[PDB]
Scaffold this active site. Structure first.
Site, short mmCIF file in Angstrom:
data_model
loop_
_atom_site.label_atom_id
_atom_site.label_comp_id
_atom_site.label_asym_id
_atom_site.label_seq_id
_atom_site.Cartn_x
_atom_site.Cartn_y
_atom_site.Cartn_z
N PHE A 40 0.16 -1.62 -0.22
CA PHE A 40 -0.08 0.20 0.10
C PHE A 40 0.78 1.57 -0.11
CE2 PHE A 40 -2.61 -3.45 1.63
CZ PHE A 40 -4.54 -3.34 1.25
N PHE B 275 2.81 1.43 4.03
CA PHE B 275 2.85 0.56 4.33
C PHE B 275 2.80 -0.96 3.11
CE2 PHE B 275 -1.14 1.26 5.21
CZ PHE B 275 -2.03 -0.29 4.93
N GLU C 15 0.62 -4.96 3.94
CA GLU C 15 0.15 -5.99 4.91
C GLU C 15 0.75 -7.22 4.26
OE1 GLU C 15 -3.53 -6.43 3.30
OE2 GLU C 15 -4.35 -7.49 5.24
N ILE C 16 0.75 -7.68 5.75
CA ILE C 16 1.90 -9.29 5.34
C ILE C 16 0.61 -10.38 5.94
CG2 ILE C 16 3.50 -10.79 6.26
CD1 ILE C 16 5.31 -8.50 7.02
N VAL C 17 0.50 -10.46 4.86
CA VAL C 17 -1.13 -11.60 4.45
C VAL C 17 -0.76 -13.27 5.19
CG1 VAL C 17 -2.44 -12.72 3.02
CG2 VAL C 17 -1.42 -10.52 2.55
N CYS D 49 2.91 -16.61 6.07
CA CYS D 49 3.91 -16.71 5.96
C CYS D 49 4.38 -18.29 5.86
CB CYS D 49 4.72 -15.77 6.70
SG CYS D 49 4.63 -14.03 7.01
N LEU E 112 2.68 -4.06 8.62
CA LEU E 112 1.49 -4.72 9.28
C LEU E 112 0.80 -5.51 8.94
CD1 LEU E 112 -0.05 -1.36 9.06
CD2 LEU E 112 0.78 -1.73 10.71
N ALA F 125 2.42 -17.58 15.44
CA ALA F 125 3.27 -16.70 14.85
C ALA F 125 3.74 -15.50 15.37
CB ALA F 125 2.32 -15.72 13.77
N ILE G 249 -7.22 -3.07 5.12
CA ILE G 249 -6.42 -4.02 5.80
C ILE G 249 -7.28 -4.99 6.38
CG2 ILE G 249 -5.69 -2.47 7.63
CD1 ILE G 249 -3.48 -3.61 7.94
N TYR H 132 -7.70 -9.83 10.85
CA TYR H 132 -8.64 -11.20 10.70
C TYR H 132 -8.98 -11.87 12.23
CZ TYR H 132 -6.36 -12.33 5.54
OH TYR H 132 -6.15 -11.74 5.09
C1 LIG Z 1 7.10 -19.14 11.58
C2 LIG Z 1 8.08 -19.78 10.32
C3 LIG Z 1 7.22 -19.43 8.91
C4 LIG Z 1 9.38 -19.56 10.10
O1 LIG Z 1 10.14 -20.75 10.63
P1 LIG Z 1 11.58 -20.60 10.68
O2 LIG Z 1 11.75 -20.96 8.97
O3 LIG Z 1 11.29 -22.20 11.07
O4 LIG Z 1 11.68 -19.92 10.82
P2 LIG Z 1 13.47 -19.56 11.87
O5 LIG Z 1 14.21 -20.79 11.46
O6 LIG Z 1 13.84 -17.92 10.50
O7 LIG Z 1 13.49 -18.63 13.06
C5 LIG Z 1 14.45 -18.79 13.78
C6 LIG Z 1 14.10 -17.86 15.28
O8 LIG Z 1 12.84 -17.45 14.99
C7 LIG Z 1 12.36 -18.11 16.33
N1 LIG Z 1 10.85 -18.34 15.92
C8 LIG Z 1 9.87 -18.33 17.00
N2 LIG Z 1 8.29 -18.52 16.87
C9 LIG Z 1 9.35 -19.68 15.87
C10 LIG Z 1 8.13 -20.77 15.00
N3 LIG Z 1 6.56 -20.77 15.05
N4 LIG Z 1 9.19 -21.22 14.75
C11 LIG Z 1 10.31 -21.27 14.19
N5 LIG Z 1 10.99 -20.19 14.61
C12 LIG Z 1 10.55 -19.43 15.56
C13 LIG Z 1 13.27 -19.01 17.01
O9 LIG Z 1 13.11 -19.84 17.96
C14 LIG Z 1 14.00 -18.79 16.53
O10 LIG Z 1 15.17 -17.41 17.49
P3 LIG Z 1 16.83 -17.58 17.24
O11 LIG Z 1 17.27 -17.66 15.85
O12 LIG Z 1 17.59 -16.54 18.42
O13 LIG Z 1 17.55 -19.29 17.54
C15 LIG Z 1 7.84 -20.91 10.04
O14 LIG Z 1 7.27 -21.43 11.35
C16 LIG Z 1 6.37 -22.00 9.55
O15 LIG Z 1 6.04 -22.56 8.48
N6 LIG Z 1 5.18 -21.56 10.46
C17 LIG Z 1 3.96 -22.07 9.89
C18 LIG Z 1 3.26 -20.95 9.65
C19 LIG Z 1 2.95 -20.07 10.78
O16 LIG Z 1 2.99 -19.69 12.53
N7 LIG Z 1 3.14 -18.70 10.40
C20 LIG Z 1 3.24 -17.54 10.92
C21 LIG Z 1 3.08 -16.07 10.34
S1 LIG Z 1 5.11 -16.15 9.33
#
Ligand SMILES: CC(C)(COP(=O)(O)OP(=O)(O)OC[C@H]1O[C@@H](n2cnc3c(N)ncnc32)[C@H](O)[C@@H]1OP(=O)(O)O)[C@@H](O)C(=O)NCCC(=O)NCCS
Length: 161
Positions: A72, A77, A79-81, A83, A115, A122, A146, A149
């Site tokens: 936007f 800003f 919007e992060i939909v 991840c 945002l 998460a 925006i 949810y």
């Molecule tokens: C959230 C997500 C996208 C990122 O996971 P990832 O690729 O394993 O993340 P990272 O390995 O880069 O995380 C590293 C850091 O994040 C922290 N963290 C917090 N929440 C986390 C989670 N749910 N999963 C993994 N790490 C997480 C870790 O403790 C770590 O801290 P450190 O670097 O000091 O050791 C993944 O867990 C996922 O697909 N989650 C399911 C969907 C979800 O919950 N999405 C939220 C929207 S992004």
């Protein structure tokens, strides 16, 4: 083995490419399996929406993660939909690289605000990426087009230089 980042989209301009088309589906698949609170039809609806773009994490030619976002510019800003990283590739830093890379992509376009409505599981991720519940941006600027949810915790992040 080989990692690559590609920002892709279904832009109504010129993107019916087969390679990016398979990536969009791969993104829909990963988002759908990792984000249960988002109906799969809905995810497909936005991932393919021309106004939305998605930063894809490709590994050995296959999508293993990504971030769907809706920029936007006017309101200054993005919007992060969605991840997600596939289960087998999680806890390796890829989620970190994605957010980092996406931040730089936005500093480049002159957009310094993120945002998102973080989900129960998460919150920890966004926190470790620099997001905070305390919104550093007026409501009049985002509250409008925006999606808010239900059950999600609104969070924000302001970028560096
Ligand atoms: C959230 C997500 C996208 C990122 O996971 P990832 O690729 O394993 O993340 P990272 O390995 O880069 O995380 C590293 C850091 O994040 C922290 N963290 C917090 N929440 C986390 C989670 N749910 N999963 C993994 N790490 C997480 C870790 O403790 C770590 O801290 P450190 O670097 O000091 O050791 C993944 O867990 C996922 O697909 N989650 C399911 C969907 C979800 O919950 N999405 C939220 C929207 S992004």
């Amino acid at each position: 083995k080989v990692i690559e980042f590609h920002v892709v989209g279904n832009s109504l301009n010129q993107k019916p490419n087969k390679k990016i088309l398979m990536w969009l589906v791969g993104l829909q698949n990963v988002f759908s399996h990792q984000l249960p609170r988002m109906p799969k039809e809905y995810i497909t609806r936005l991932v393919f929406d021309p106004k939305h773009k998605t930063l894809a994490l490709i590994k050995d030619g296959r999508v293993i993660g990504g971030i769907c976002f809706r920029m936007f510019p006017s309101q200054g800003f993005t919007e992060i939909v969605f991840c997600a990283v596939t289960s087998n590739e999680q806890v390796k830093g890829y989620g970190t690289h994605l957010m980092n890379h996406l931040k730089e992509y936005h500093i480049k376009h002159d957009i310094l605000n993120f945002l998102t409505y973080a989900d129960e599981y998460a919150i920890g991720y966004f926190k470790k990426q620099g997001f905070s519940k305390e919104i550093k941006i007026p409501k009049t600027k985002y509250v409008g087009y925006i999606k808010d949810y239900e059950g999600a915790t609104l969070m924000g992040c302001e970028l560096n230089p």
